[PDB]
């Protein structure tokens, strides 16, 4: 009878429990201690000013109402029981479409320790907003965020606090960089307070710092443009009588630069201001003219 | 009769069954054996750094609670009973969007054996993330894996293995990709070590070797022949100024057109590749 006690504990655990009331309603401020392991920093979609991040999101609070005693010290809960307990309703302020994976079973886990400590692990992909300023395209560097916090619980009800020192509470896996275009440089985690029309909320931010690679635009736009300008200038070395020859240089080099500029600005998203590559293209076209 | 007899058999098995408890909760770990019948590998997208595969993913374990003697025949139960049993919390470590097909009913299998063995099958389309390195593109081999782990149970509670251990994965040799060709597949079982324990893991790794004849015919042949055509201007006599200018400058134009149309046809990979190096070489020669 080594499971009779286990099942008695599991059934008695949720007697007199109210999943509508946060732990310590009138007595404390619920302190959810967050922690994020970024398994892979997914692709940064330049067109949409978004970026995907696949994370293990661990939140640990204290529920005095689940203090049990028995032969076990740590007690696991299935998802059916995890839906019957109060859990922080964290969301991502800048998230667009986050997906929590449920294959083959919900990628969630909830543990309870004797003293009433709850640990909630989730695996989820967050497709968040990465507002970009491409004035230095393709030589731009971005610092775009992952801000998350609580919905419906102001700063006086639920206060998030990173588990260890802010910068050791968000970690990116070694092979987690799934970016083929940028170079994840570093990360700055911080905590702040946001004031809205509904109250004051705790917000846990994590800026990921990205630097764009240049080696592709170099050999794909810059060198073709430079060679086209050099070729246009080389027309001066031909003798003057060869009017058809020099005219053909002029016009066909204009056509090549037209094609190159069209292709480069096809590669760039459809921003409404001049980038560094755009200035280079403009000056090159002026040179050929 | 027989029909009722089995009705009471299954009802008795399920009455007083605690889904929250794994097989042999207080005892040795439960061993789960896995098969995969790869139905298809659909799309290997270099832009999204992912591939898609449809499989018949099967697991088999022992659940002494689900043991019966009063019938000999292998029981096969309606999939809706898989909700009332314990099934391992396996998850695919590198997937992005996965789903079990649900037409005409939820595509899964639950099959009990008289000795307690439980077989549990799903029909899954998983979009796995395949890290890629296309420096050598299009002359590159891409090792695309699928990693299977257990979320909550450690090796002290659950153990993973391939059922058969070398034939566990079938249907792979019959996969006909449009752009690649499976040259080998490996099965690797292991126990990975993390902070709070060691978790089991299996790994199905394909090596995809990209077919080259297309890329030859479409990208290299035009560029090589345009380089030769540019050379043609040398046999044209020095006086033929308009002729040699036409030839050379039009060859530059054609090389630019080829480059800027392959830039679109080819997957948008914003780092430098071997194909780009070759096109740059031909351009520099013109």
């Amino acid at each position, epitope marked *: 009878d080594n499971t009779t006690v286990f099942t008695r504990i599991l059934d008695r655990l949720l007697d007199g429990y109210d999943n509508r009331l946060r732990p310590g309603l009138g007595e404390r401020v619920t302190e959810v201690k967050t922690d994020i392991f970024v398994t892979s920093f997914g692709p940064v979609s330049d067109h949409d000013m978004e970026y995907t991040i696949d994370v293990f999101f661990r939140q640990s609070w204290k529920d005095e109402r689940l203090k049990f005693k028995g032969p076990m010290t*740590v007690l696991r809960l299935n998802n059916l029981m995890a839906s019957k307990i109060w859990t922080p309703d964290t969301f991502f302020h800048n998230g667009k479409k986050s997906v929590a994976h449920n294959m083959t079973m919900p990628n969630k886990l909830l543990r309870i320790t004797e003293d009433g400590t709850l640990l909630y*692990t989730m695996r989820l992909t967050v497709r968040a907003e990465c507002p970009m300023h491409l004035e230095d395209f393709p030589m731009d560097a971005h610092a775009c965020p992952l801000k998350f916090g609580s919905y419906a619980y102001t700063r006086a009800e639920v206060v998030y606090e990173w588990t260890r020192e802010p*910068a050791r509470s968000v970690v990116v896996a070694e092979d987690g960089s799934r970016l083929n275009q940028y170079d994840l440089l570093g990360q700055t985690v911080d905590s702040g307070i946001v004031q809205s029309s509904t109250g004051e909320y705790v917000v846990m931010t994590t800026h990921f710092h990205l630097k764009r690679k240049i080696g592709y635009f170099v050999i794909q736009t810059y060198l073709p443009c430079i060679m086209t300008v050099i070729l246009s200038q080389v027309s001066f070395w031909l003798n003057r009588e060869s009017v058809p020859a020099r005219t053909v240089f002029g016009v066909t080099t204009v056509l090549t630069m037209t094609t190159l500029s069209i292709s480069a600005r096809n590669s760039l998203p459809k921003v409404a201001y001049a980038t560094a590559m755009d200035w280079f293209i403009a000056v090159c076209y002026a040179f050929v003219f | 009769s027989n029909m009722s007899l089995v009705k009471e058999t299954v009802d008795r098995l399920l009455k007083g069954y605690d889904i929250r408890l794994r097989p042999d909760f207080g005892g040795p770990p439960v061993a789960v054996g896995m098969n995969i019948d790869i139905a298809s590998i659909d799309m290997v997208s270099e832009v999204n750094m992912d591939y898609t595969l449809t499989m018949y993913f099967q697991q088999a374990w022992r659940d002494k609670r689900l043991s019966y003697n009063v019938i000999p025949l292998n029981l096969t139960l309606d999939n809706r009973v898989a909700d009332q049993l314990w099934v391992p919390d396996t998850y695919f470590l590198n997937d992005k969007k996965s789903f079990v097909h649900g037409v005409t009913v939820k595509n899964r299998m639950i099959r009990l054996h008289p000795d307690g063995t439980v077989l549990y099958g799903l029909r899954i389309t998983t979009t796995a993330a395949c890290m890629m390195d296309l420096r050598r593109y299009p002359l590159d081999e891409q090792n695309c894996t699928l990693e299977i782990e257990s979320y909550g149970y450690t090796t002290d509670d659950i153990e993973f293995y391939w059922r058969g251990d070398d034939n566990a994965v079938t249907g792979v040799t019959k996969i006909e990709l449009p752009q690649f060709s499976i040259v080998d597949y490996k099965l690797i079982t292991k126990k990975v070590v993390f902070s709070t324990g060691s978790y089991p893991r299996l790994s199905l790794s394909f090596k995809l070797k990209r077919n080259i004849g297309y890329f030859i015919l479409q990208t290299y042949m035009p560029s090589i022949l345009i380089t030769i055509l540019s050379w043609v201007s040398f046999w044209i006599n020095y006086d033929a100024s308009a002729a040699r200018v036409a030839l050379g400058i039009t060859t530059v134009l054609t090389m630019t057109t080829i480059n800027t149309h392959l830039r679109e046809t080819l997957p948008k990979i914003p780092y430098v590749k071997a194909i780009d190096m070759y096109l740059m070489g031909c351009f520099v020669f013109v």
Partner: antibody
Amino acid sequence: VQLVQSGAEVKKPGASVKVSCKASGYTFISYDINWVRQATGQGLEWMGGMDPKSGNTGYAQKFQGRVTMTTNTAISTAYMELSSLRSEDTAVYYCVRGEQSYDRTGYSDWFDPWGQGTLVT
Amino acid sequence: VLTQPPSASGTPGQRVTISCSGSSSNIGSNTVSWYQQLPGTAPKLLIYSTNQRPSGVPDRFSGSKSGTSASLAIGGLQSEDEADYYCAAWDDSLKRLVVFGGGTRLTVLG
């Protein structure tokens, strides 16, 4: 990786004491520096930690208002300053590096380099 | 706060086991690590994460954790293992707290 530490010190009760811990062989800012005391007659005790990157500190409960663990990134030293000395403060003060691993399933901490170094009152 | 035997003993060859017992907020939640201390010198790391072994410590040593208790099993006990053995486990009752055990003086009979 080593945590070469200051020489012995002798002082009379009530006089602030200084101990220093120069680290070499590892990026001094990546890992943390925990100070562990050890009285000759009894077992180990944890004085407190400090992150060499943020300066964040965690002095133990029994030394909440008696310690000052600062750190000098330039020369990669972390020197503790115990104050309000007493007769029970005589012990070998060790400098340890709190190596740490974090991954999917939580954290796990330990102290691999360790050091030496003493003080008597 | 962690409590372990004041001292243990074992004849050479015999497998002796030192144990630590603590509340659920340090060992029940975190991983222990064991620290040998040869007589008079500075303690060294012997086991971390309760199972892993630092490069240098022979496979002879092995640790385990069961619920709220930990055990260091010194198989094939030899003479040079005569030392103190402590166990540490970071506590979750405050953001930075690590609690050492009392320590165990292990002696080699003979």
